[PDB]
């Protein structure tokens, strides 16, 4: 398959995240009694870049300290089946700045 | 060739040189309760504006939290030592960009 990777801005990225949050709002309040939460994405900083993975990422209610991440496998067998979430990777581009050349005299 | 594009690392270079330019001046004027921050970040028009110039602040006790209050762009007190020459310029942070699969773009409306 020829899979297309294209460039989008922050606002277009925001709608992508918002849509995923909308698609799992139907699931999380229903399964809130199980102490489990389904996050449709995962943000991780590798290779000096912000990686935003898309998928099924689960959480479990904490006990005491001083919501824990369970990974990608569903915890409870007798929980209702989650909605279908697509799997993809988003890589944030390096930040760019419009700069006057004069103030580059700090060399 | 006035205005060009630099990425994050060179942007952090310019920020640090300004902070170093005022570090020893700020230590001298610490007793006055006055801080010269050599830049000003404005999030106007959904974009990170960073303005190069003199920005003076001062310290006071507001409810016990010791909050910084903006003073202006000039020396608040006549008998303070003169500041370093901070240039005047504007830096615009470009809109954040992302590489995304086109399928989830179509499949997420």
Numbering used by the authors:
A (entry chain C): 1 to 66, 70 to 110
B (entry chain A): 3 to 111
Study authors write:
We identify a hitherto uncharacterized protein factor that we term UBP (ucm-binding protein) that interacts sequence-specifically with the ucm and determine the structure of the protein both in isolation and when bound to DNA. UBP is a highly abundant protein, and we reveal that it plays a role akin to bacterial nucleoid-associated proteins with over 300 binding sites on the Sulfolobus chromosome. Importantly, UBP interacts with the N-terminal domains of MCM. Taken together, our data provide evidence that UBP functions as a general nucleoid-associated protein that plays a key role in facilitating the egress of the MCM replicative helicase from DNA replication origins.
We additionally solved a second structure of UBP from crystals that had a distinct space group (P21). Interestingly, these crystals, which were twinned, had four dimers of UBP in the asymmetric unit. Two dimers were essentially identical to the initial structure (C2221); the other two showed the same dimerization interface, but the subunits had undergone a ~10° rotation with respect to one another.
